[PDB]
Design a protein around this motif. Structure first.
Motif, PDB file in Angstrom:
ATOM      1  N   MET A  90       0.830  -1.196   0.000  1.00 17.56           N
ATOM      2  CA  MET A  90       0.000   0.000   0.000  1.00 17.56           C
ATOM      3  C   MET A  90       0.873   1.258   0.000  1.00 17.56           C
ATOM      4  SD  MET A  90      -3.338  -0.534  -0.264  1.00 17.56           S
ATOM      5  CE  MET A  90      -2.797  -1.454  -1.703  1.00 17.56           C
ATOM      6  N   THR A  97       2.983  10.826 -10.581  1.00 16.90           N
ATOM      7  CA  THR A  97       2.127  10.993 -11.743  1.00 16.90           C
ATOM      8  C   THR A  97       1.760  12.454 -11.954  1.00 16.90           C
ATOM      9  OG1 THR A  97       0.031  10.867 -10.560  1.00 16.90           O
ATOM     10  CG2 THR A  97       1.080   8.780 -11.155  1.00 16.90           C
ATOM     11  N   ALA A 150       3.194  19.073 -10.890  1.00 17.18           N
ATOM     12  CA  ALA A 150       2.856  20.267 -10.121  1.00 17.18           C
ATOM     13  C   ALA A 150       3.968  20.607  -9.123  1.00 17.18           C
ATOM     14  CB  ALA A 150       1.535  20.057  -9.410  1.00 17.18           C
ATOM     15  N   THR A 151       4.063  21.877  -8.732  1.00 19.51           N
ATOM     16  CA  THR A 151       4.920  22.303  -7.639  1.00 19.51           C
ATOM     17  C   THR A 151       4.449  21.665  -6.334  1.00 19.51           C
ATOM     18  OG1 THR A 151       5.533  24.326  -8.640  1.00 19.51           O
ATOM     19  CG2 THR A 151       5.475  24.338  -6.240  1.00 19.51           C
ATOM     20  N   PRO A 205      -2.042  26.192  -9.243  1.00 18.45           N
ATOM     21  CA  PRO A 205      -2.143  25.571  -7.920  1.00 18.45           C
ATOM     22  C   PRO A 205      -0.994  24.597  -7.659  1.00 18.45           C
ATOM     23  CG  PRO A 205      -3.618  24.480  -9.477  1.00 18.45           C
ATOM     24  CD  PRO A 205      -2.885  25.549 -10.264  1.00 18.45           C
ATOM     25  N   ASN A 206      -0.744  24.364  -6.378  1.00 17.10           N
ATOM     26  CA  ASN A 206       0.262  23.406  -5.973  1.00 17.10           C
ATOM     27  C   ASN A 206      -0.326  22.009  -6.085  1.00 17.10           C
ATOM     28  OD1 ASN A 206       2.311  25.148  -5.418  1.00 17.10           O
ATOM     29  ND2 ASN A 206       1.785  25.327  -3.220  1.00 17.10           N
ATOM     30  N   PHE A 207       0.518  20.973  -5.954  1.00 20.58           N
ATOM     31  CA  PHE A 207       0.070  19.596  -5.950  1.00 20.58           C
ATOM     32  C   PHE A 207      -1.020  19.365  -4.898  1.00 20.58           C
ATOM     33  CE2 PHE A 207       0.351  15.324  -4.125  1.00 20.58           C
ATOM     34  CZ  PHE A 207       0.016  14.573  -5.236  1.00 20.58           C
ATOM     35  N   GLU A 253      -8.485   2.732  -5.933  1.00 21.78           N
ATOM     36  CA  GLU A 253      -7.553   2.443  -4.857  1.00 21.78           C
ATOM     37  C   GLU A 253      -7.820   1.046  -4.312  1.00 21.78           C
ATOM     38  OE1 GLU A 253      -7.993   5.699  -2.131  1.00 21.78           O
ATOM     39  OE2 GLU A 253      -6.415   6.899  -3.115  1.00 21.78           O
ATOM     40  N   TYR A 293      -6.609  -1.582  -6.858  1.00 17.63           N
ATOM     41  CA  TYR A 293      -5.192  -1.851  -6.645  1.00 17.63           C
ATOM     42  C   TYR A 293      -4.996  -2.716  -5.401  1.00 17.63           C
ATOM     43  CZ  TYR A 293      -0.072  -0.798  -6.372  1.00 17.63           C
ATOM     44  OH  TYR A 293       1.298  -0.845  -6.317  1.00 17.63           O
ATOM     45  N   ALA A 294      -5.853  -2.549  -4.384  1.00 17.73           N
ATOM     46  CA  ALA A 294      -5.700  -3.277  -3.129  1.00 17.73           C
ATOM     47  C   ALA A 294      -6.088  -4.750  -3.284  1.00 17.73           C
ATOM     48  CB  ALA A 294      -6.466  -2.616  -2.005  1.00 17.73           C
ATOM     49  N   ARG A 339      -1.230  -4.036 -10.886  1.00 19.22           N
ATOM     50  CA  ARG A 339      -0.546  -2.840 -10.440  1.00 19.22           C
ATOM     51  C   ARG A 339       0.216  -2.180 -11.595  1.00 19.22           C
ATOM     52  NH1 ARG A 339       5.406  -2.295  -8.170  1.00 19.22           N
ATOM     53  NH2 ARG A 339       4.924  -0.605  -9.631  1.00 19.22           N
ATOM     54  N   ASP A 340       0.445  -2.903 -12.697  1.00 22.93           N
ATOM     55  CA  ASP A 340       1.232  -2.324 -13.781  1.00 22.93           C
ATOM     56  C   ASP A 340       0.327  -1.644 -14.809  1.00 22.93           C
ATOM     57  OD1 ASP A 340       0.718  -5.034 -14.271  1.00 22.93           O
ATOM     58  OD2 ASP A 340       2.717  -5.500 -15.084  1.00 22.93           O
ATOM     59  N   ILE A 357      -2.935  -0.129 -13.457  1.00 22.52           N
ATOM     60  CA  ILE A 357      -3.744   0.808 -12.687  1.00 22.52           C
ATOM     61  C   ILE A 357      -3.057   2.179 -12.630  1.00 22.52           C
ATOM     62  CG2 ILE A 357      -4.635   1.172 -10.291  1.00 22.52           C
ATOM     63  CD1 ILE A 357      -5.401  -1.730 -10.314  1.00 22.52           C
ATOM     64  N   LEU A 358      -1.736   2.185 -12.701  1.00 16.95           N
ATOM     65  CA  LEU A 358      -0.989   3.417 -12.620  1.00 16.95           C
ATOM     66  C   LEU A 358      -1.125   4.296 -13.859  1.00 16.95           C
ATOM     67  CD1 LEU A 358       0.121   2.507  -9.893  1.00 16.95           C
ATOM     68  CD2 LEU A 358       2.391   2.707 -10.888  1.00 16.95           C
ATOM     69  N   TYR A 397      -4.465   6.315 -13.192  1.00 15.22           N
ATOM     70  CA  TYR A 397      -4.385   7.242 -12.079  1.00 15.22           C
ATOM     71  C   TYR A 397      -3.683   8.515 -12.530  1.00 15.22           C
ATOM     72  CZ  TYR A 397      -4.013   8.650  -7.070  1.00 15.22           C
ATOM     73  OH  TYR A 397      -4.171   9.302  -5.866  1.00 15.22           O
ATOM     74  N   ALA A 398      -2.607   8.375 -13.322  1.00 16.72           N
ATOM     75  CA  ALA A 398      -1.931   9.515 -13.919  1.00 16.72           C
ATOM     76  C   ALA A 398      -2.888  10.307 -14.805  1.00 16.72           C
ATOM     77  CB  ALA A 398      -0.731   9.070 -14.703  1.00 16.72           C
ATOM     78  N   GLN A 414      -5.106  11.939 -12.564  1.00 17.23           N
ATOM     79  CA  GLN A 414      -4.438  13.058 -11.921  1.00 17.23           C
ATOM     80  C   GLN A 414      -4.483  14.252 -12.864  1.00 17.23           C
ATOM     81  OE1 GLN A 414      -2.963  12.824  -8.721  1.00 17.23           O
ATOM     82  NE2 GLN A 414      -2.451  15.007  -8.754  1.00 17.23           N
ATOM     83  N   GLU A 459      -6.012  18.225 -12.080  1.00 16.41           N
ATOM     84  CA  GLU A 459      -5.142  19.302 -12.331  1.00 16.41           C
ATOM     85  C   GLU A 459      -5.515  20.199 -13.471  1.00 16.41           C
ATOM     86  OE1 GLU A 459      -1.067  18.079 -12.622  1.00 16.41           O
ATOM     87  OE2 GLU A 459      -1.180  17.244 -10.579  1.00 16.41           O
TER      88      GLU A 459
END
Lengths: 246, 261
Positions: free
Chosen positions: A173, A183, A186-187, B92-94, B197, B200-201, B207-208, B210-211, B214-215, B218, B222
């Motif tokens: 996890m 991924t 961003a800053t 904005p920040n992360f 999530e 993935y659990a 897992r190769d 799901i990423l 998510y990107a 993401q 953003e």
């Protein structure tokens, strides 16, 4: 002067399918100076070498040096090109070359050869041997590992935990949590990655602590004690680096 | 020239105009840009409400001047500033994807903003309909009459400008409500991130693959946050001061003539 070929050999060896197993944002960067000194850096956290992986005798890790301020270590976190550059900067040397695949290399070109790697250029076998991870990032700790007899191995570690039961391998996890800011561009993704990696470091350390305190085999607790000392170093470095940038 | 006309027009101009809205615009969600937009509207509506009270005092003074002008033909602690500008964030920040999702769908989702826009647009329409108070005179003629017609015309033009600004705030609140529904459509819903999530659990075997989702999940988030930081930055509404009403002082008592036969 020599061993550019050795630099590209180890640069192909990090770039194998043994440990680059679909980790989003993971890549290595290898570099050599005019002196002949080999320096590597990855893009996951600080002083990270993967589990059960060895480095040759000349190789210095960029994010693992003590002559370098911790604030300029944390500045170069997850950006391995900038890391080997900053290593050369305070370590007074001029970089001869940087190796990798040109997607990774698109960021910087200040008088650097920009060596590109292809699918035939990298063999898909790692096959290199040298120093265990404790001996790469903390050779002070690796020398007092070696003067510990196999009976007295618990003198290096803190006491046996108040819980007798194993803590629980939740690492699959925490690793995931760790990959989440990678991924993003961003800053502030750097800092969030370092926090999640610090939590992974502490849980790994507690698992190695319990592993040494519960086993009764020589090589088994020597693995567990070396793992504990390595994650002791990594947790400390991450805490200093997270704290120095507030 | 007639005196009772002036005395009636003074009462007509002094009369109450529309009540402006007083309900506060509440932020549509818990994101910082949403709160900044709502707070800017709070400040704009407060300043506008103060300036409309100042216009009411000006109409009172204009009515007093009309009464004194009618007596000529017979016998009967702070000041207005600009609106403060809420400081808004840049790029904005992360932010954690689950956290951004959880904040975006926590709130009234733009109901208070719609009620704000409705109230201010109705207020707009009511001030527009209430401008016959400032028309010319039928019977009253001369120099003082022309000066009073000019003063009434200035108040009419200020009232119409105030109506335009009320419409502008309404359109600002409407815009932030549309921006929020676009953000709710484009950002990944919370159930989907928690399910991802959990997926993935369940199979870390997946897992190769799901990423890359998510990107993807993401990146959008953003874009949403960048646009919601950029487009929910509202210009503050700076109303003009109401023009001063003509000041006509009370005349001296009228000399009775035919006196001394």
């Amino acid at each position: 002067g020599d061993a550019l070929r050795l630099a590209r050999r180890i640069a192909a060896a990090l770039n194998a399918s043994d440990n680059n197993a679909g980790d989003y944002g993971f890549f290595w960067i290898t570099a050599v100076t005019t002196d002949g000194s080999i320096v590597v850096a990855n893009s996951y956290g600080l002083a990270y070498i993967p589990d059960g992986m060895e480095l040759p005798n000349k190789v210095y890790l960029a994010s693992a040096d003590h002559a370098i301020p911790v604030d300029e270590i944390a500045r170069c976190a997850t950006y391995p090109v900038l890391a080997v550059q900053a290593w050369a900067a305070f370590h007074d040397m001029t970089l001869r070359a940087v190796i990798g695949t040109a997607e990774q290399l698109a960021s910087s070109d200040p008088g650097v050869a920009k060596i590109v790697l292809e699918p035939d250029d990298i063999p898909e076998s790692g096959k290199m041997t040298g120093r265990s991870r404790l001996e790469v990032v903390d050779p002070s700790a690796a020398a007092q590992l070696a003067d510990t007899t196999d009976q007295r191995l618990l003198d290096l570690l803190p006491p046996a935990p108040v819980d007798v039961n194993p803590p629980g391998d939740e690492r699959h996890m925490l690793w995931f949590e760790l990959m989440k800011p990678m991924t993003s561009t961003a800053t502030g993704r750097e800092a969030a990655h370092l926090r999640a990696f610090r939590a992974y470091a502490a849980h790994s350390q507690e698992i190695a602590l319990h592993q040494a305190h519960t086993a009764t085999d020589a090589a088994v607790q020597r693995v567990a004690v070396a793992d504990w000392l390595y994650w002791q170093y990594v947790t400390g470095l991450l805490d200093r680096a997270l704290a120095a940038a507030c | 020239v007639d005196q009772q006309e002036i005395l009636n027009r003074a009462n007509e101009v002094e009369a109450p105009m529309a009540d402006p809205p007083t309900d506060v615009p509440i932020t549509p969600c818990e994101l910082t840009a949403a709160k900044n937009a709502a707070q800017q509207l709070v400040l704009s509506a407060d300043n506008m409400r103060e300036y409309l009270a100042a216009g009411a005092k000006e109409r009172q003074r204009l009515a007093t001047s009309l009464r004194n002008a009618a007596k000529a033909y017979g016998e009967v602690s702070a000041e207005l500033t600009d609106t403060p500008r809420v400081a808004t964030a840049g790029e904005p920040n992360f932010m954690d994807l689950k956290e951004a999702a959880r904040k975006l769908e926590t709130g009234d989702q733009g109901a208070s903003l719609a009620h704000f826009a409705d109230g201010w647009n109705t207020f707009n329409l009511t001030l527009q309909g209430d401008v016959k108070r400032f028309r010319g005179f039928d019977n009253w003629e001369g120099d003082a009459a022309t000066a009073c017609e000019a003063s009434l015309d200035q108040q009419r033009q200020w009232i119409l400008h105030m109506a335009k600004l009320s419409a502008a705030m309404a359109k600002q609140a409407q815009y932030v409500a549309q921006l929020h529904v676009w953000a709710r459509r484009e950002h990944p819903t919370y159930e989907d991130i928690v399910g991802l999530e959990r997926l993935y659990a369940e199979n870390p075997s997946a897992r190769d693959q799901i990423l890359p989702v998510y990107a993807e999940y993401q990146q959008r988030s953003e874009k949403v946050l960048t646009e919601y930081n950029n487009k929910a930055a509202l210009e503050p509404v700076n109303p003009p001061k109401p023009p001063p009403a003509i000041k006509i002082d009370p005349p001296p008592p009228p000399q009775e003539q035919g006196l001394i036969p």
